[PDB]
Each structure stands twice: as structure tokens, then as C-alpha cells.
Amino acid sequence: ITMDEEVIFETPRELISIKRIKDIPRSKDTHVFAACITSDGYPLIGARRTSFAFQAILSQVSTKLLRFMYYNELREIFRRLRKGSINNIDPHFEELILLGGKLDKKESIKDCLRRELKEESDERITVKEFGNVILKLTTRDKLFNKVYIGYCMACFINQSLEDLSHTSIYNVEIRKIKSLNDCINDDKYEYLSYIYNMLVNSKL
Ligand SMILES: COc1ccc(CCNc2nc(N3CCc4cc(OC)c(OC)cc4C3)c3cc(OC)c(OC)cc3n2)cc1OC
Ligand code: NA
Ligand code: NA
């Protein structure tokens, strides 16, 4: 990816634009993401603890939304839609997110990522080296028309994929950490692949 050129991806749920930028704006708190590459060369992705569809429903059922929730969330909704409800369609859905979190503008991007990666990983991830390229990710969700922005950098970590296979049940942020290639059927797979490919190629 070249400085300030933008690439656009569409999924059934989102329109996302990905653009290389020089500096993250520091007028407000922002969100920063890590494209994390394990020591054995696998790209990592997190499964968000709560799905975006369920969070949207809570903050406000369309059946397109029932295709994009976790099964425990669905059971909570169906217990209310059907009286003696004992099961419902399970879409085998996971809400894929890059690891990372909030950057106020006290801290460097690097200290922020080290901290958030260690909290989201139950203190297992440590960063061997960072990349130098920052990508701005702008998503517009199609169902609720909300716009969300975050900034992504490469993190080459010390741990192997296998090191990160289990995640504590008390992890408030993510249900698990996995390889992105274990998510090929997810509708975010194309643009997440692009992010990793661009950040790794820039590193090389
Ligand atoms: C209508 O009412 C609401 C609705 C939602 C919400 C949740 C807002 N929080 C939030 N939203 C995000 N988006 C954008 C993407 C997206 C995608 C969807 O499908 C794929 C989607 O399907 C429905 C909704 C969203 C909202 C985020 C995106 C991220 O990209 C990586 C991220 O990184 C960690 C964190 C994000 N956090 C609050 C509402 O009430 C105020
Ligand atoms: Na589930
Ligand atoms: Na995809």
C-alpha cells in the first residue's frame, strides 16, 4: 500500500476503506489495532466476546441479524421470541476483530499496543518487533449505518500460534485468539487478509 491511497472492500455487513497514513490524529482518543504475526508465521485474529449485532440489539429482531450472533446470545433472544424455546439455528458465527484497544494521547502507539495485547491475551503476548506502516481502517456498517475508525500496525510477536490456543473465560474482550486461516468462511476474511499482506510486505 502507498501513502494515502485507499482501498475499498464490501461485505454483506460492512463497507470498509483501508488507507495508509503517516500519523494518527491526536485530537481525540482513538482505537489502535495490531496485525499480529506469530513466531511461526501465522496471522492472529480475535473472536470478540460480544457480537456487534447483539450489542446493537441491546443498545436499541431483523432476521439478517440472527445470522451474525453467537449461540449464547441467540438463546437469550429466542427465549424471549418463542415460549418453550429449546434451540434455534446456530450460524457458527464469530465476530472477528484485530487485537488492540484504546489509545489516549498520553502514550506512544507502541506502549499502547504492548499493553492491550498483553491484556487481551491473558498476559501471554509480547512484541518482538513493530512495523513502521500505519493503516487507517474506516468501516461503515450497512445495517445501522454507524461509522467506526481505527488504526492498524504490524506486531511480530514472540509466541507461536499454539502458545495462544486457550483464552480465559473471564476475558472481557475476546472469547479466543486464533489463526485467520481458521476463519476462511468469515465475511471479513478478504479485507483482513489484505491488511496482513500489506503490513507484512511493507516490513519485507
Ligand atoms: C445501532 O446501535 C448500535 C450498534 C452497534 C454498536 C457497537 C459500537 N461499538 C463498536 N462498533 C463497531 N462497528 C463497526 C463495525 C460493525 C460491523 C458490523 O458488522 C460487521 C455491525 O453489524 C451490526 C456493526 C458494527 C459497528 C466496531 C468495529 C471494529 O472494527 C474492527 C472494532 O474494533 C474492536 C470495534 C467496534 N466497536 C453500538 C450501538 O449503539 C450505540
Ligand atoms: Na456460538
Ligand atoms: Na472475506
Author numbering: 3 to 62, 71 to 214
Give me lines lifted from the publication on this model:
Vaccinia virus (VACV) represents a family of poxviruses, which possess their own decapping machinery as a part of their strategy to eliminate host mRNAs and evade the innate immune response. The viral decapping enzymes differ greatly in the substrate specificity but share the catalytic motif and the ability to cleave m7GpppN-RNAs to release m7GDP as a product. D9 is expressed in the early stage of infection and8 together with D10, it prevents accumulation of dsRNAs, thereby minimizing cellular antiviral response mediated by PKR and OAS/RNase L.13,18 D9 exhibits specificity for N7-methylated cap structures and a preference for longer RNA substrates (>30 nt).
Three most potent compounds had IC50 value below 10 μM, and they included an adenine derivative seliciclib (IC50 = 0.57 ± 0.05 μM), quinazolinamine derivative CP-100356 (IC50 = 2.7 ± 0.7 μM), and a purine derivative SCH 58261 (4.5 ± 0.8 μM). To better understand the mechanism of inhibition, we determined the crystal structure of wild-type D9 bound to inhibitor CP-100356 (P3_B7) to 1.78 Å. This crystal form has two copies of D9 in the asymmetric unit (all-atom RMSD 1.811 Å), each bound to 1 molecule of CP-100356. The conformation of CP-100356-bound D9 is nearly identical to a recently published structure of D9 bound to m7GDP product in the post-catalytic, inactive conformation (all-atom RMSD 2.55 Å). Rather, the 6,7-dimethoxy-1,2,3,4-tetrahydroisoquinoline moiety extends into a small cavity past D151 and E16. It is clear from our crystal structure that CP-100356 inhibits D9 cap hydrolysis by stabilizing the enzyme in an inactive conformation, preventing conserved aromatic residues F54 and Y158 from binding capped mRNA substrate. The crystal structure of recombinant D9 in complex with CP-100356 was determined, which revealed that the compound targets the m7GDP-binding site and forms stacking interactions similar to those observed for 7-methylguanine, suggesting a competitive inhibition mode. Nonetheless, based on the similarity of these compounds to natural nucleobase moieties, we hypothesize that they likely bind in a similar manner, that is, by stacking between F54 and Y158.
